[PDB]
Symmetry: D2
Subunit: 359 residues, 4 copies
């Protein structure tokens, strides 16, 4: 008996969430899976406008009593400053729930358009392992000599032995379990003269632990190009918070698009609920036009299943299914405008809704 | 009567530098231009191995007596830690010479291969304006509780009203002088909760100064994708140190490559020499195989001219020439392996060496 | 025609302020001095309770239109957190008015009790020069991993070439004008490994500017003892913000007491109003018992005069007077409980009120 | 069978150390105590001049094999920068040996001179509990815009939940075991707006754990005065690194002197050796004149015993003895120039050497 917390948040969160739930309830009934959903108004800019705070003070004790989070997106600069909204909701989720891994599997699905030249289709496959607790995402620092010629602004990056070690481990593992078993650590150990060399110190230190696994270390600029221009190289790519919510948009949209970009925010020791979300944001530019690609949002529930079940081949089943459901509709051509289709958001929700049965 | 300081530095710096000088001495003689070159051993890892320091203590007083710097690249991790080498040489150049603008013009040259799908050729053109004195490139911070379970690592980002204002100005200017006059400021004002919102505060503040110029502000992740997938959008793109030596590799290699990527490190008030370099690094992987694309290195001297002359239509002339010299050889197909050609570095040096006369 | 802003603030500010004004209006009338007082409710915890903020948003434009500030004290932990109240009022005064010098003359007045053993009386005399804009008084930093085993708390000290140079200058000056011309810079350049050595670097650098002036540098611990045990040594003592509102209590109370401790918050270039206050705080423990020593508060107005007049021997006159008015009452024995007397606050206000005429 | 590591270090360390050892070997033989001394050249400026580093790389593995450290003092600005020398030796001791408590018992010994007025003699007694791992003693930060008008200098204070909690505990304990059971936490939670309020947050939090123990919290300025002027008040005084090596000189020399000031650097869980030292430093001003008060140095060995024995009443015995040995010689008048005596350092060593037998 599972319990799932669903939060559409802002913008297209409301839009793509019901079509994530939809294609999931299909497998639920279809495979005898204990999926008992719920919806929460907070973690939105409506809630913030109304209450002064992004969520109620007791959000956690609330959520702690659930198995997983199915999250939409958060942000509406029109009405709420972006830091306020991310820090006040999602950031507190990942943070106070110790979901230190943020993964973003990157792939070309049979027949997806290519914003890269003539690569064999499917010859692209890897995951991106993003530090999600610390690093360059901070609230530390402040403004000095405010409003004067001499104005200074400080921002601390904080790297610790724990967050780094643990995210570095969880990457000599997702490679310890693959065909290539290769790792590229991202760094900028020429620019940053204190943080990155350290990161490299610990990268290097834990290569000595998995001697069969093969690793290199590429400066985030080149890595970004190599990302677009030679995605066959990469198997595992491990990175700091910033070198996470970076790449995340580039990659899943290196050739394809950010509409088909899944992400997972994980607490491996299960001591807290993990959270599942697409890579994209609230996209105010597109909201209420139901044209938004819900694949990322779907792919997300799939991963929610894949992770969530653990000890069942039962839940495992559902994943592959749903990704094939994705896979068909892709080449079947029932897609959203940011991929070719003339279809709508719910259209593409209903298009997946079919294939799951047909096979 | 000009004086130019030439420093190949490490790796392919030695390799691409003599072919930068070459195609430049052609125009010099060809247009009556006061180019009196010189070469310096230091800012290399040979020098560092030998002397303990990347350059002599009196490098500056030395260089201050020259008009411009033609720089190769610096770095050799095999023998010198990357931060030590960048900080000890080039970083001190840009820093102690107040070369706060770092620009990287991004373009498709007639017939360049496309790591983006079917775009009109030449339908891509913009410059990237990179803060080069402060920002996320620091030596501030350090390690606490060293070697223990509790190990912490601090890195300060420092933004000031001066460096920010001045780089933001110098961008409502390179657009104040163009067909589109559009600016995209890069930010991550949802992740970074102190630095980026401030940056945006000052971005916004100086949009009120150039009301004809049009601006938006895109989070560095999306901006990176939009970089690859829709480069026609961008005219001017302004960014912090990190959001500089980032993009710089992606962009000039969004479709094309980092071999044809020029950069300029500028001190507009001319109080110090400006420095001219390609975007790429010492590329140990390729050194001594004379296959390295010297275009970036050439394009660099061109820009050295373009900037350096100022009040001459005399020097201006040379630029356009040399870029056409580039332009022909491109479509003429006399290029290096990272572009299609079977040619060598000096081959491609000699290939440019021709066209400059023929027209 | 002068204009004075009077702000009692919290606690005994209300108490000692009317007795500062009192003995001042005496000299005003007595010497033909343009003193046109005013009183402001804000910079108090009553105002903060009422308005949510320590003062109105337009406090500055308001105050900018006045010549000097006669300030009480600020703080009431019972109702307002101490940082909130200091930062929200007085700290903004000293800060946004560029009052970078904070001086605290330390002396034994004929017949004051001695919390030091058998020193010649009057054999003690020096001033303390306190950096008042930057240093260890910051709002920079923050909390990371909040509420967890791993909780970390960051606080930045910021030293700049401006604030340091300028406070160091203004000290090779108050000694350039004295019998001894000696300077002790306070440091802790063994503990603090970045800030203090730098401070010393610049201390040292500006000893080369006033070669007749004699200087040493004593670690703040020893300096504190030497403060109590050998106060004849010190002429000038220059220090960082923290090594300011430190000493300030010790010294003026090394033997005597914090009730007779004047301070001056100065903007030498007069571009802003200077502020005048006693060294002590709101002293909630004593409030509304009118036993509080108003000397510090009086001594303060005296200094307000001494500084304020500048180009008059006219205003200068008043000072010496008022300090003799102090001096008599001291040995005359008309003092408050923290000095021996059975008298009240207004009693001691009226006791000074006399002597000013009698001579 | 104990093993003791003795390190005179610099200056008067060499001077007062043999007279610490002396009066200790007396009790050793006198009480059947396993004291097997040794002497080490390093942690000195001679060693540093010679080797480039304050101690050998393997100092720790060396020392780890000993029970306690009897330390002299470190520092010689004439030849070695003060931070280099403290950080390179003693600071690494306290740090890498997790000696997080630094205690400084403050007392008037029968007939000691009084740099405070007419207090009952012996009516003064308390200990000072100093955080010794973190706080305001850092190597974090650095210099930005070096050598320019805009020069900035950053220093991080780091407070953690561990170091703070643990030093705060170890103080609701040294009071949980006394006549008064009172605690004064030192703070400056009006100046420092991030660190001190936090410190207070955790002070307050752990008052809820020892409800019988009574506590207040005094701003470090006033606390310093109250230190001199009313030392009967204090029982326990708990403080951050800076508010440690501060007070430490003031207090033990509030009336008396820094020559009779003991300190203890403790690792309560005994997982590492604890270190024992006087409060004073190398005192270059006095070195080689054998006039230096070795009481502090003796008092230190006494405490080394007091702590070291633990489960023996055997070693306990020795302490009281040795302090009475101190106590007599004090009133007996066999003291050093900084207390009245005409005696020398070894004279006063031999003076203690007697009394230990006579009773
Ligand atoms: N994890 C989260 O909750 C995230 C929230 N945000 C927030 O959302 C707001 C907007 O951020 P942006 O920079 O625009 O990033 P975004 O993801 O909201 O939009 C990026 C671009 O992709 C388009 N897009 C996004 N999802 C799409 C879909 N599935 N199908 C077709 N097109 C799609 C949008 O129109 C936009 O042009 C901001 O307030 C930002 O802070 C941004 C990133 C992640
Ligand atoms: N401005 C500067 O002096 C720079 C120096 N470096 C330093 O140089 C070293 C190597 O850095 P990387 O991460 O490899 O960046 P890189 O520029 O040295 O090489 C990046 C990739 O591009 C290739 N490449 C570079 N220039 C090329 C050319 N013109 N033609 C064909 N291929 C080319 C290289 O083989 C490599 O695969 C490091 O020590 C780094 O710190 C890196 C960037 C800039
Ligand atoms: N410049 C300013 O506005 C200052 C404000 N404060 C604030 O005031 C509040 C109390 O701070 P404390 O630590 O008690 O320092 P305080 O100055 O308020 O009191 C220190 C001690 O001296 C006594 N005292 C002060 N002035 C006296 C006088 N003239 N005659 C006789 N006794 C006197 C008080 O009873 C108390 O025991 C806090 O909220 C603090 O932040 C503290 C220092 C300076
Ligand atoms: N724990 C340690 O190893 C300490 C080392 N130092 C270092 O030692 C050097 C000197 O520091 P200072 O600021 O002078 O503090 P200090 O302790 O070396 O001397 C302070 C004053 O007390 C006198 N003094 C010290 N011990 C005495 C004794 N037992 N009897 C009579 N007089 C005594 C000295 O002459 C001097 O006037 C510096 O290099 C400093 O960094 C300073 C404090 C502690
Ligand atoms: N999302
Ligand atoms: N370069
Ligand atoms: N005050
Ligand atoms: N010591």
């Amino acid at each position: 008996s599972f319990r799932i917390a669903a939060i559409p948040g802002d913008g297209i969160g409301l839009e793509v969430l019901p079509e994530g739930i939809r294609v999931l309830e299909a497998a639920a009934l279809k495979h005898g899976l204990a999926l008992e959903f719920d919806t929460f108004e907070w973690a939105s800019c409506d809630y913030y406008l109304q209450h002064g705070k992004m969520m109620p003070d007791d959000w956690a004790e609330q959520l702690k009593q659930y198995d997983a989070i199915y999250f939409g997106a958060v942000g509406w600069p029109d009405k709420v400053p972006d830091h306020i909204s991310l820090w006040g909701s999602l950031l507190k989720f990942r943070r106070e729930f110790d979901q230190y891994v943020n993964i973003r599997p990157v792939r070309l699905f049979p027949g997806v358009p290519c914003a890269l030249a003539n690569r064999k289709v499917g010859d692209i496959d890897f995951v991106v392992v993003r530090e999600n607790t610390e690093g360059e995402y901070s609230s530390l620092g402040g403004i000095m000599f405010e409003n004067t010629e001499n104005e200074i602004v400080i921002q601390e990056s904080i790297f610790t032995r724990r967050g780094v070690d643990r995210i570095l481990k969880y990457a000599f593992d997702l490679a310890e379990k693959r065909e290539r078993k290769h790792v590229t650590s991202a760094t900028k150990s020429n620019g940053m003269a204190i943080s990155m060399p350290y990161w490299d110190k610990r990268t290097e230190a834990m290569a000595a632990h998995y001697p069969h696994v093969s690793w290199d270390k590429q400066h985030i600029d080149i890595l970004c190009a190599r990302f677009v221009l030679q995605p066959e190289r990469f198997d595992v790519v491990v990175a700091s918070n910033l070198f996470g919510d970076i790449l995340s948009d580039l990659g899943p949209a290196c050739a394809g698009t950010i509409g088909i970009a899944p992400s997972a925010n994980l607490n491996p020791e299960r001591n807290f609920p993990s959270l599942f979300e697409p890579v994209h944001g609230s996209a105010p530019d597109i909201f209420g036009k139901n044209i938004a690609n819900p694949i990322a949002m779907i792919w997300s529930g799939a991963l929610m299943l894949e992770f969530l079940g653990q000890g069942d081949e039962r839940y495992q089943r559902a994943h592959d299914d749903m990704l094939n459901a994705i896979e068909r509709v892709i080449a079947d051509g029932s897609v959203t405008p940011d991929m070719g289709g003339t279809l709508s958001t719910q259209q593409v929700g209903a298009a997946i809704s079919d294939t799951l049965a047909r096979l």
